[PDB]
Amino acid sequence: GIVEQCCTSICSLYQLENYCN
Amino acid sequence: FVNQHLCGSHLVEALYLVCGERGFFYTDKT
Ligand SMILES: [Cl-]
Ligand SMILES: [Zn+2]
Incomplete structure (x- = not known):
């Protein structure tokens, strides 16, 4: 999930946009 | 050390x- 993907290496806003509703 | 807790506060x-x-969900399944 998001902690795995984005607390282990940096997620840009482009990558985070995946998680929006 | 509460690394994950602190990371999540930034992620949100x-x-x-x-x-x-659009908003977003932030759950146990996210
Ligand atoms: Cl921090
Ligand atoms: Zn912080």
Whole structure:
């Protein structure tokens, strides 16, 4: 999930946009 | 050390910023 993907290496806003509703 | 707890507090702010009016879910399954 998001902690795995984005607390282990940096997620840009482009990558985070995946998680929006 | 509470590394994950602190990371999540930042993740929710970054999600808030990119998502805008779309909003987002932040659960145990996210
Ligand atoms: Cl921090
Ligand atoms: Zn911090």
